[PDB]
Structure formats: structure tokens, C-alpha cells
Design a protein around this ligand. Structure first.
Ligand SMILES: [Zn+2]
Lengths: 49, 397, 397, 397, 397
């Protein structure tokens, strides 16, 4: 949960699961970005944010 | 191995300290340990079982941390932690049963199961917690070559043995001499007999002796010595040495004369006691040497003098015996005793899942066959399995 | 009940950790527990006693908090805390004696005294501390329906019984057959006899059997088996079945032939052992079935052959016996044993204050009468009283 | 004395909690204790040994503090602390052996060695840590005159004694009456006999009695009572009272009639039990009074009636016996028992270093001679030495 | 298990309360429950059946919510809800038949089918509704260890038994004495007979007795007692004990003299009734002890005196009997009775789908074989299956 993560302040797992490449699903209500480019898909953009 | 004890120590404390209504400062340092278990264990996957009828299970850890923000713990905080503890405590049962069931002959002190070999990486070393139990403290002192010690109450140091020895015999079996004994558990009952009652012995004294060697060296024992063997006191019929015929033994019992008990170590007399019954000590020994003798009484009332004639028909046979019993001692290798149930947990797992006979242990985990030939290859396996059985006893009785 | 253990745990630790000269960081978390006891307990008032000769006392709590500002504790800080601990430790004695003395028949697992019913409110739940003892851990696992277990050293599982059975008899009592036994504590000594020594039996073999049912199911026992009953080995005179006449029994003792010990569970054979003496295990059982037989020896020396004629006057009677002994086992209900003194604390309170016989327990707390009819209504009362007796043993020996 | 336990408690915890890879918050309060040991102990110098063959060693403390800045402990932090612990744990061994070996007669409860007198200053009182063991808790409660208690398993309360008493005798020794007994450890086996089998007694009943006084008052005992003395059941020959002649004893055994066991305290009957065998309790007593009687059976089959004639030749002598055994009890003074090895650690130090016989203890630390004359001057020495032996057992097994 | 009852409770109420034309405020709180069922159940998938001839079906839930906007419900709103209820009520039938058919021996109180193990997650706990039935209330009180109770009308507490006992017999079978009985269902008919009609008995009175032990403890029973056994009143021929020969029994019937009925609990007399027929109560018992005696009438008319001679040919045999019948009682374990059909629903599922004999229940679900050996392992299975059979009876009769 992104909200309970935000209220607690102590992360300690989102740091670990991201540094050591762990599979994860972040439940939230984010806004997104649309993208219409094959060059931006080959360039591996979605894993850099 | 050190991190398998550290998983069970903080799951035992998590069911005891995380209760409803308790103050947060009572559990403020356990939760920092329990959260740091979970961070190390996530993302990994394990596999236990496969031998005998022990089923194959797969383990996978994806859990969330505990909250660190309450003042008094409530029923939401307890019930969200019990459904995490109950998955770990099921994992530790199936790793401990996977290790008590396996054995090796080259180096038995190494881990044998697939899961315990994987827990011995430096990734999992941060789960390490205090090592305060008796078996995990002696696991660490002995791993650095320092002196260890286990304290026992009535240790099973003697294998079962019940036999005799005839120093004088004939096929009629009516004029005999020798000793009889029972060595079982932690108790020795020896009894010497003489049918003629020393009528032709020099100075009417017959000498007896019985020497019991041990398998391991005991230290600071408390021993009770009583001057009667109550088991070899009644009339019985006994077979011969090769099972051919039977012979009759009708005892009357005198008191043991000139008793000397010696406690040897590499042939050196450490302790000795001469006509001193009751409780005695024995600081360091590995061989017990009992010595006692029969003396014909020089003065006899008319009711006694009919029992012991000069001629051949002896209907009442003289008997002199002792009784020794070890109450508590300190050994350095693992053994079995009368207080703790570590031998019973090992055999009950092997009998339940129909485990085949391996290369090291006797068939059926027979303790009489295991202490008889107690090789250093069996000692390293027996310590490795009693220590895992001690870890499992904290969580699951 | 959970908060009665939590009062005694932090009064035991308060006499141990709050000593003179100690560093403040050693006791920095105990004082936060001990101050939070006092805040909950102030303003309340209690009343204990009233049954038998147990006197009525009134309790009232108005105390002040402890200081949290020193670096090393001094003699002012110790002596101002000892006169607060000594009032609480007198309160817990009179609540524990008020609960060990009362009993109910409908639901015995509920609290019965007036003070312990009042401590079971949600106001008093913040006094709750860790639950690490054996009896308070099994109080909580069994309250959620999870599997428990108590570890015993020589458990009193057998009621006292000493009797016999005659499978062949006549009013002269000179040609008999049957078994004799003693079941007492944790030890079985059975012995079978035959006066004719199987002179007319088919293949000169006489079969014996003795079946002992248990009251509760034992788990992972360590059992010692020895091939002689030393109690039924000497000549004695025994009364008849209805106390009319007496009969004489003069034994000689052969060895037991073809011994089979079986360990049953709902009529299913869990374990079996055939001519295997010494130490054995028994993983799960509730019925012990001993089987052994007498065989006439086919070859006899002239000293033996006079003992067993073909005609009627039999002056030397054949005897075959066994001996079984449970060293340690794990049960699920509470029992008595040889190591801990929880039964002795319960009876000593009832005998001292002249307590009348209630509806559940036998008169005088007779353990032979209580394990004979060990109903589920008596099991819930006996666990509730042994657990209170375990709490009182931490403070007052 | 209180600071000698406090040195050993935080050296035991330092080898258990300071391990490789552990989190720093697990050991954050131990290091504040261990650093504050070192600050107090630096600059001082000590001297142990000197009596017997115990060598003289000089001790000098100049060490540095431990680091308080890591997050997880590494192998540099462990290996720099092990070479500080190993010097302190060698110091505590030689202070504990210096104190178990010395004794005084005026005030034995005071420290006797040179090092333990120096540790009893107010400079060293800041090393004081929690006092949670059994012997150090009873050291402090008894030092303020509060009630203490030690829990034992089979306590050695009876000195060794094996003798008899003849209430009717003649120089032929063929018509006798009296009792025989064995008192050893925690077990009483008394047996009364009568050769005439009450043929001329009034109402054919012969009364027996055996009274055993204790040395210290026991509390809440669990006692097993069985109606046979198995040791006085076989034929034997016994010397006379002054060792002049020998006399013969050929028993047959009836059951004990009208058994009454009483538990006295200052001549007042606390408990009583009438024909009730099995397990019994005894809440407070210091004298056991056994009473039992022989009754001639009024109806006898022809096999029994030949044994007991009216005339003088009695070839089969009647015998009635009992058996008592204390399983566990609570005393207030220190004793020896079957579970713990505190007596064995004291004698093994004195035997190893060839220590001369002092003014208080018996030669060779004979427990039969020490419980026979158990003076209050020996009680204060025996508690002071068992408590030091309990401190040494934490570090060095 | 708790959520399986909660599915069936709000499908029963949905077919009853959602009718055509009803006001919306009558069903305003049911629709909030029924919509919140659907939200939890969507997206999941299940699988039932597989054992015996029970077919395998797959379940998948993708439904839409109900409308919450009408004032009176119309035929569109009913017919769009009936085609959702009819899919759920078919799902609950196949989960209840999947659970009544399976059994385990280790822990039978746990769910055994694949679907009911999946419903026991915390995701499905929000479907939980009120628990007001008798079996689901006793499922929850007994799961927390509180006292429960089931109310029965004529409970099947006695296994079927019809036999006799001869206290006096000879191979001619013409002078006999003893009792006959029938124990079946909830009724005891015992009858004692004597062929000589007490012509040589002391004071012409013959004593009879019949003791019936129960399997479980009954509470607050209503019992009818009538002074005649109508089943043992006519002439019949009966086989011998070993089936060798047959013997004849021609009764005449006197009235029972001196009737005493006792109601025991652990050997203690709870209730007693002396010559009191009709309806009686029994508050707490587990053993019924009937006692009655035959008395020869001292005065006889000439038509009676011919029936009972002094010599040997007895053509009219005396008979005295009783009759007991339990109308209603309260037990704590589950049983069978004469009012409800929970035993008939369990056996009809197993017989229909040809289910093999498992490890726990008798072959064919024989109630005489199941109440004879009514072990605690069978009690936990029998409660788990009667409770599932009670849930299925709400939806499908
Ligand atoms: Zn013991």
C-alpha cells in the first residue's frame, strides 16, 4: 500500500526490494503517462522512474 | 545451524511477549529482531522432505513488516502477527525433521538436508540471536576446540548385560564358584558365590573381583553404594554356558567382607574407598573396579552350623554381593538419561515415516547396540541430531 | 488468570534486578512496567479468604511511582521499593490460596474466587507481561485449541494395584496357575507361575499374558525393561480371593521365554519388541500388552531334576516374571511425577486450613482415587489449580 | 559475594550474546554493563591460591573499552572481545577455587579468601547485576532474615544406617522377635519378624514400631509407600550384637496388618495415614513414625499349617515389612540430592589439590559423617561453599 | 466453517424475504449482506468432488450486484435474483457433500475438503453473518473451551445388547438362577428369575442386581420406571452359552420387592430412589445401578400353592423384572436420537456414492459399533460431520 507507506515514514522494504530487484506490486491511485513510441519501448524507459 | 536456533528463539519469544494489552516498551527490542528476520527471509524459496514417507513441501516467503507505533498492543496487532508466526513455526518443524532423519559417514557434523545447507550462507547470518541454551552453547564451545560438558541425571552409560563366570565347575554342577552380574542403565549389581563356603580355602577366605570399563570418561559423579545384590538373592535355575543343561542355585547371604572400590583413569588410581557405604564421589574416572571377599564365620550357633558341612552335599550356597548406582555425572559427549527426552524425539520421527536403515546408526536406533560400539563417527552424528531435536522442542512439544 | 501471572513475574524480577549499586540501564524497562502496574491498581479494593479457616483480609492500594532519574541505584532507592513489593507479594499469596481451595463442577476452567473474577476485566489487561513459563504457555495454547504437551520425569500414571488371578485352582491350593502383579506409580512388575512346571502342557509350554490400559495417551516415552520380577521371588503366604483361607507360594525362577511387548493405540499396534531388553522407546500409546511364556527345560542336571517330579507333591513352584518402568514421557493432560511439587502445594493448603470436601475432588486429595476416575470435569479443575500453584511458587517457596 | 555472582553473570552473557553477525540493538545494554565492569576493575591487583597444592597466581587488570558504534557485529568485534573474556573467566575460576577450599569456625558466612574480602568494598559494588539464580536469591533473602526454601529431588536426608533390635532373645537364637532396618539416602525399609508367629501372643497379634527422627524440617514432601521390604526377604546369616556368634534368619512373608504412618512436628501429629498405600503427601514434619503389626491367619490350608507348629522347632520365620521413599521435598537448609552436582564439585577440588583436614568439615567430606552431626557452625560453612560452587558452574562445567 | 454457515443463512433468507410485492424496508439490510457476499466471492474459483462416485465440478463466480432503488419489489427484481440464488445453492450442496464424506485421524476437527480449506482464509471472513443455530452455537462455544450442551429426545445412548447370566446351573437345565436383559436405544428391560422360588434361600429372599455403565455423561434426564419386563414374560426356548444345547424357560411373574435405583458419577451416589415408580429425574450421572429382589409369598391360596413345591420338578418358574426408559436428556457430545435426522443424512450420502471404508468410522456407519468404541478421535469427526449436515438441511431438505 502506497498510502500506509506514506503515513508510516519508515520505508525499509521498498528500499530493499528495489535495490536487490525483487518482484513487487505497488497498490495506489497514481497518475500515469501515455507513450506512443517503439524507440521509447526498446530504450527500456518504464524501469527508470 | 546457528541461524536455525536463532529462528526458533525469536518465534518462541514472539508467542510469549507479543500478547494483548502489554506495554510497547516491553517488546520494543523483539520487534526490531522480528522485522529483521522477515527482511532477510523474503524472496527466498526452500524445499524440505523427500526421504521415506516424509512428504515434499515447498516454502515461499513474502510477508510484511510489523507496526512500531502503538503504546499498548491491541487485538488487531496480535491477530495480524499470529498469522505470520504460524507460517514460520510450520517451516521450522519441517527443517528439523528433515535433519534428524539424515546421516553421513565422512563428516557427520556438517549439515545434511538441502534447506540447512542453504541457511549456512553469509546472507542469512544477520538473523543470528543469542545462544543461551545448553546444547547450542556446547555446539559453539566445541566448534572452537574448548572444553565442554553435559550434565546428566542417571546417564545410560552401561549397555545391557546379564551373564556369569564359573571359576570352578564340573558336569554335575554341585560345587561351583564365581560371580554373577547385571549391568543395565546406570546400575551395577554384582554377586559372588561359593558352594563350599571356604572350607578348604587358605585362611577360609575367598577373593572376588569384577572390573567394568566405560566407553566415555565421566567427571564429578555422585555414586550410591549398598552392600547387597537383591537380584541374586532368591533360588533360581540357570542354563549352562552353551545352553546344554541347567543348574540350580540356592543362596544364603553373608555380609561382604573387605570391600574396596577403585576408580581408574588410564590405569591410575584416582579414588579409592575401603568399607565405606552410602554416598561417595568420583572426580574423574573411566573404569570401575569392585573388589570384595567372602569369609567363613569362625563362630556359629547350632542353627547356622547345620547349613555348612564338611562333606560334599551342599544344599545352602553362600553368596556375597554389592550394588552400585550412579545418580548424576558430567560427561563431555552426548548420552541418554532419565530426565530429558531427546532420544525419544529422534526415534519417534524415524519410526513414524518408515525410514530405511542407513550406514551409521543401528537398525531401530537401538541404544544397547549404539553405546556398545560408540565410534567417533557415530558421536559426531549423534550430537548433530540431538541438537536439532533440542531446537524443535522449543516450538513443538 | 493471565494478569495474575503477570503480577508475579514482575515482582520476581523486581526483587532480582532492583539491587543496590546496579546501573540504571539494566532496570530501565522494568521500572516502566512496575510503574504501570501501580497506576492500574490504585483506587481499587479487594477481598480474599472466607472458606474453612482461611481468614478474611481486605486489600487497598494507594502507592506512589518510582523515580526514573538516577544513574546508579542507591540504598534510598532500594529501601523505598522493598516496602512496596512486600505489600504486593502478600496480596498474591492470598489470591493464589483463595483459588487453589475452590472448585466447581459445571465449568471448572473459569475463575472461582472473588478476587480473580474481578481481575478478569479489560481495565486490568494492561498489566499483562510476557508468558514464558511452561504452565502459562500451555494455558494459552490450550485456550485457543492448539496442541499442548507437558514433560514429566517418572509420571504417576498407574493407580496403586496389587492383586492376582488364578487360572487353575482347587480348595487344597497345591496345583495352581496364573499371574501376580504390582502396578504402582510408573512401574509394572508382573510374574506368572505354574506349579506343575508344564509337565502336561502341550509341547511343555505355558502361555501368560497381562494387559494394562492407561487413562491418558502418552507420547515419546523412554521405557526400561528387565527380565525379572524381584518382588515375587521369595516364599510368602497369600490369602484367598474372598479372605476365607490362606495359601502358600514357594517359588523358583526360570528365565522368561519368548517375550513380546506391544504398545497399542485404539487397538492398533504402534510398536512391538520381541526378546529385546534394556531401554526401548514408545512413540504413541495408551495400552501396554505384555506377553511371555514358561518353557520346561528339556535337559536337566541331577540337582535340577529332583525339583520337578511327575506326581502330585510339588514343593518348588516355577515362576516367570518381567519388570517395566517408564523413565520420562510427554502427556497432554496434567499429572503428578517425581520431580516437581505441584501436587504437594495443593494438598498442603487444603490440609492446613481444614477445608470441607467439595463436589469434585476426592476426600483428602487422594491421587489413587483421582487417577482411577479421571473424568473431564476433574481434568479442567486439576489444570486450573496446578497452574495457580505454579504462579505462587515463583514468589513464595 | 554479591559482586562475584555479578562478574560471572555478565561473562556468561558475553559469550552468548556477543556473536558474529548479530544486530547491535540485541547487545546494546550488555555492552554498557561490560564496559562498566572494566572501568571498575582497572588499576587493581589481586592474588589467589596458596593452600595445599593450589598454586599462587597474581592478577592485574589493564584493558580497554569496547566499541559502541556498529550496526551489525563483525569478526573484528568478536575476536577483540574474546581475548578479554578469556582473562576474566580464568580469574573467576581461581577465586571460586580459593573460596571452596577454605573454612572458618567462628563466622563461616563471611568471606575467607584474600580476593573475596577485597571485592567486598563499596568501590566494587557498582559491578552488581541481577541476582536471578536459585542460590543467590536464597543468599539474599536469608541475609535479611526472610523465609527461604530449596527444592530437592530425592534429598540425602538420612545418614547410612543398617542394624537391628532384638526384643526377645536367648543364646541359642531360635526364638526371636524384633525389627530390622536400612536407612540410606532418601529411603526407609523396615521389617519386623517373629519366629513363633504369635502363637502365644494375646489375640495372636504382635505389635511393631519404628521411629526415625530427622535432622532438618522438611516441607511439602511427596512420599511413596509400599507394603513390602524386599531387602529383608531372603535367607541370610547375621552376626550377634557384639560380634561373638552368628544367627540364622529364614523368612516367610505375610502382609502387614493395621499400618499407621504419622508425621510429627515437635511431638504434634501433623498428618496420619491408615492402611493407605501409594503416593501420599506430608506438608510439614521432622519425625516419621511407622507402626504396623503381625496377625496370625485364623484359617489355613494344609500347605500353610505345616509351616507354623505349636512346639519349639520353627524352621520358617514370619516377617512383616514396609518401604518408604521420599521423591521430592522442600527444605530450608542446603542438602545433597540426586539431580544437581554441587557436592561433587566441592570434594573434587579438595581431593585434587591435597588439602589438609581443617577444623569444621569431616575428613574427606564424608556426607554420612556430616549429616549425622549437622551443627549450625557446619550449616553456615556448607551454604557458603555450595553457593560459590554454583557460581563456578555457570562459566566452567 | 463459520463462513459456510454464513453462506447458507443468507441464501435461506434470500428465498424467504425477497418476494414479489414486498416493501423495500423489509429487505433493506438483507440486500446489503447479499451484495457483500457477491463482492467477496467474485474472481475466485473452486473445485469439489473426486472421491468415490462423487463427480468433479468446477465453480466460477462472476455476478452483478442487486438494485437498491425500488419502493416495492416487482417481478423483474425477483426473477433476476432467483437465477443468482440458484447457482449459489447448488455450490453449497456440493461443498457440504464433499465434507460429510471425508475424514481424518490426526485432527478431525479441521476442514478436510479442498473447498472448505480455501474458505478459511481471512479474505472470506467478511461474509460472516449471525450464528444462531444450535450446532453452530455449540461449534463456537466449544472452540473457545466453554461449556456446551445438546438437548435430545430419546437419545441412542445404549448399544444393542441382548444376553443373560446364569448364577446357578447344571447340564440338565432345570434349576437355574440369574438375570436377562435387553439394552437397546434408550430403554433397559432387565428381569431376574429363580426356579426354586427361594425355597432354600435365607429368609426366602433372593437378591438380584444389574449395572449398566454409560459412554458419556448425561445431565438432567427425565426417566420413566415401570415394575414389569414385558419382553421376558412368555415361555421361550433359549440356547446355551456356547451354542451347544437349548434350555426352556416358563415364567410366572411376581412383583419386584425392595427396588433401589442408583445414579452414579465416578462411584459417587448422586441420586437414589427406593420403591418409587413413575417419572423420576437424574441430574448428573454416567452409571445406572438397578437393584431388586424376589421374596417368596408367605401366604398362598390353594391355587397358588400347587405351583411351587418343595421337590425337584419345577414346572412354573418365578420371574421378577423392571423397565427403564429415558425420555429426554442433555449431553455434551453429539449423539443420535428419535427426533432429528442428522445421522440419516450422513449415511445416505456415503451409501449413494459408493464410498470406501476409511480409517475412522465403522463400515456402513454402524451406530452400534460406533457407540461401543466411542473414542475421542471419533467424537471430533462425528461433530464435524453432523454440523455440516445441519448446514445442508437449511437449503436442501
Ligand atoms: Zn530421578
Amino acid at each position: 500500500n502506497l498510502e500506509e507507506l506514506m503515513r508510516s515514514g519508515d520505508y525499509a522494504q521498498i528500499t530493499n526490494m528495489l535495490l536487490n530487484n525483487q518482484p513487487v506490486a505497488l497498490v495506489g491511485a497514481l497518475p500515469f503517462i501515455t507513450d506512443s513510441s517503439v524507440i521509447s519501448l526498446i530504450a527500456k524507459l518504464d524501469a527508470t522512474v | 545451524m546457528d541461524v536455525l536456533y536463532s529462528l526458533s528463539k525469536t518465534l518462541k519469544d514472539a508467542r510469549d511477549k507479543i500478547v494483548e494489552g502489554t506495554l510497547y516498551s516491553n517488546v520494543s527490542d523483539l520487534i526490531q529482531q522480528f522485522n529483521q528476520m522477515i527482511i532477510t527471509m523474503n524472496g527466498n524459496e526452500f524445499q524440505t522432505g523427500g526421504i521415506g514417507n516424509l512428504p515434499i513441501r515447498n516454502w515461499n516467503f513474502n510477508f510484511g513488516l510489523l507496526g512500531t507505533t502503538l503504546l499498548n498492543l491491541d487485538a488487531n496487532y496480535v491477530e495480524t502477527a499470529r498469522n505470520t508466526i504460524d507460517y514460520f513455526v510450520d517451516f521450522v518443524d519441517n527443517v528439523c525433521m528433515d535433519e534428524m532423519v539424515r546421516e553421513s559417514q565422512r563428516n557427520g557434523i556438517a549439515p545434511q538436508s538441502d534447506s540447512l545447507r542453504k541457511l549456512s550462507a553469509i546472507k542469512f547470518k544477520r538473523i543470528n540471536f543469542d545462544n543461551s541454551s545448553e546444547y547450542i552453547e556446547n555446539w559453539n564451545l566445541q566448534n572452537r576446540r574448548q572444553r565442554t560438558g553435559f550434565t546428566f541425571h542417571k546417564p545410560n552409560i552401561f549397555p545391557y548385560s546379564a551373564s556369569f563366570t564359573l571359576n570352578r565347575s564340573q558336569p554335575a554342577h554341585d560345587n561351583l564358584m564365581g560371580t554373577m552380574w547385571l549391568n543395565a542403565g546406570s546400575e551395577i549389581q554384582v554377586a559372588g558365590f561359593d558352594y563350599s563356603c571356604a572350607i578348604n580355602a587358605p585362611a577360609n577366605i575367598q577373593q572376588f573381583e569384577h572390573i567394568v570399563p566405560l566407553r566415555r570418561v565421566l567427571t564429578t559423579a555422585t555414586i550410591t553404594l549398598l552392600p547387597d545384590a537383591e537380584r541374586f538373592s532368591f533360588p533360581r535355575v540357570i542354563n549352562s554356558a552353551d545352553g546344554a543343561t541347567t543348574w540350580f542355585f540356592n543362596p544364603v547371604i553373608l555380609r561382604p567382607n573387605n570391600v574396596e572400590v577403585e576408580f581408574l583413569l588410564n590405569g591410575q588410581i584416582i579414588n579409592t574407598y575401603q568399607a565405606r557405604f552410602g554416598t561417595i564421589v568420583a572426580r574423574n574416572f573411566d573404569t570401575i573396579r569392585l573388589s570384595f571377599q567372602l569369609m567363613r564365620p569362625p563362630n556359629m550357633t547350632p542353627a547356622v552350623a547345620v547349613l555348612f558341612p564338611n562333606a560334599q552335599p551342599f544344599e545352602h550356597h553362600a553368596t556375597v554381593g554389592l550394588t552400585l548406582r550412579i545418580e548424576s555425572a558430567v560427561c563431555e559427549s552426548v548420552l541418554a538419561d532419565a530426565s530429558e527426552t531427546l532420544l525419544a524425539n529422534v526415534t519417534s520421527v524415524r519410526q513414524e515415516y518408515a525410514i530405511p536403515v542407513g550406514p551409521v546408526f543401528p537398525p531401530g536406533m537401538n541404544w544397547t547396540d549404539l553405546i556398545t560400539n560408540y565410534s567417533p563417527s557415530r558421536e559426531d552424528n549423534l550430537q548433530r541430531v540431538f541438537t536439532v531435536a533440542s531446537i524443535r522442542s522449543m516450538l513443538i512439544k
